[PDB]
Amino acid sequence: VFHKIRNEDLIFNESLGQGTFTKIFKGVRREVGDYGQLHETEVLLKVLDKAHRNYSESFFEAASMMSKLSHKHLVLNYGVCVCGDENILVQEFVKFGSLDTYLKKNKNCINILWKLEVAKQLAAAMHFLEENTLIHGNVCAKNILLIREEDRKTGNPPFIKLSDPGISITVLPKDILQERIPWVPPECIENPKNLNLATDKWSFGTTLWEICSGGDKPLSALDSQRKLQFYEDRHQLPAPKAAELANLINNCMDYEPDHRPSFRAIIRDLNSLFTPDLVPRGSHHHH
Numbered sequence: 001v002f003h004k005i006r007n008e009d010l011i012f013n014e015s016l017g018q019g020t021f022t023k024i025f026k027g028v029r030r031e032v033g034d035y036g037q038l039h040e041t042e043v044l045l046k047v048l049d050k051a052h053r054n055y056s057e058s059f060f061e062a063a064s065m066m067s068k069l070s071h072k073h074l075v076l077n078y079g080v081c082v083c084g085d086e087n088i089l090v091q092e093f094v095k096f097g098s099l100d101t102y103l104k105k106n107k108n109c110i111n112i113l114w115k116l117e118v119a120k121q122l123a124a125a126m127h128f129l130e131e132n133t134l135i136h137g138n139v140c141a142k143n144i145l146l147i148r149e150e151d152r153k154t155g156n157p158p159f160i161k162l163s164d165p166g167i168s169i170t171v172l173p174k175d176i177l178q179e180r181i182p183w184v185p186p187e188c189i190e191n192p193k194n195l196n197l198a199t200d201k202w203s204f205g206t207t208l209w210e211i212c213s214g215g216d217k218p219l220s221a222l223d224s225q226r227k228l229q230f231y232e233d234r235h236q237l238p239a240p241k242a243a244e245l246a247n248l249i250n251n252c253m254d255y256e257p258d259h260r261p262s263f264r265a266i267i268r269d270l271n272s273l274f275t276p277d278l279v280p281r282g283s284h285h286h287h
């Protein structure tokens with residue numbers, strides 16, 4: 001049972017963007033808070049598109065996953081609005097918005113440690129889900145939200161959260177799934193109901209690619225037919241210049257689901273990259 005928030009206690013402000021079958025708005029919620037004090041809080045209002053109301057059950061059940069879990073890297077739910085004929089979730093408003101937009105705007109000022117920190121934080125969230133045997137199913141840079149920017153005055157890192165997964169791929173049309181290549185793994189295009197924990201390891205690889213590519217969208221130049229063919233031909237994404245991160249991307253985007261690495265191993269690989277290696281590559285041989 002979601003906490004029910006009266007529409008009279010919600011003010012809908014600017015559009016903040018859109019997801020699959022959804023639109024998001026910035027809102028203000030009026031509530032009685034701790035100590036009976038009336039407060040106003042910024043909120044995210046996520047509205048299921050009128051043209052997609054048949055997915056309402058999957059829309060709410062996906063958000064309920066994050067009501068049952070509490071973790072510092074997971075977006076908070078506040079409740080649902082009794083907004084008449086509208087299916088509307090009231091969630092935490094993350095100040096700096098989605099990571100894909102942020103990476104694109106700030107691609108000049110983001111260094112490798114920033115990227116490693118964000119990737120390690122996402123891997124920490126995903127290890128928590130893995131340990132709970134829960135499948136997200138929609139890991140992408142758009143669904144990663146930036147709580148706080150890096151503070152170069154102190155060395156403090158950025159801080160991210162992962163959003164709820166939205167409507168499950170298990171109910172989505174094939175045409176939608178094809179457009180979601182290469183986030184949706186190859187085995188889930190024809191049979192999305194076969195998704196498993198290995199699904200999220202593939203998508204994590206794609207998301208790490210996004211992080212390393214300044215918010216480019218992989219394979220955006222390929223139409224749906226050519227995206228399908230990319231999987232038929234067993235291609236990998238183009239390597240970022242950071243070779244060790246290219247290796248991790250590709251290890252996660254293994255066409256064999258059972259060979260994709262655990263999130264514990266992913267975290268280990270990321271952690272190792274924080275320590276500089278000043279020995280020239282290939283020094284085991286003398287010329």
Ligand SMILES: Nc1nc(Nc2ccc3c(c2)CC[C@@H](N2CCCC2)CC3)nn1-c1cc2c(nn1)-c1ccccc1CCC2
Nearest residue numbers: 016018019024044092093094095096097098163164165166
């Ligand atoms: N929680 C949650 N806060 C937020 N803040 C947010 C979103 C957009 C902006 C801002 C904040 C302000 C910053 C602005 N910049 C621009 C440059 C300077 C300032 C950018 C605008 N966005 N956001 C969320 C976002 C999504 C899903 N969920 N939440 C989502 C999850 C699953 C399925 C579908 C969706 C819907 C779309 C993605």
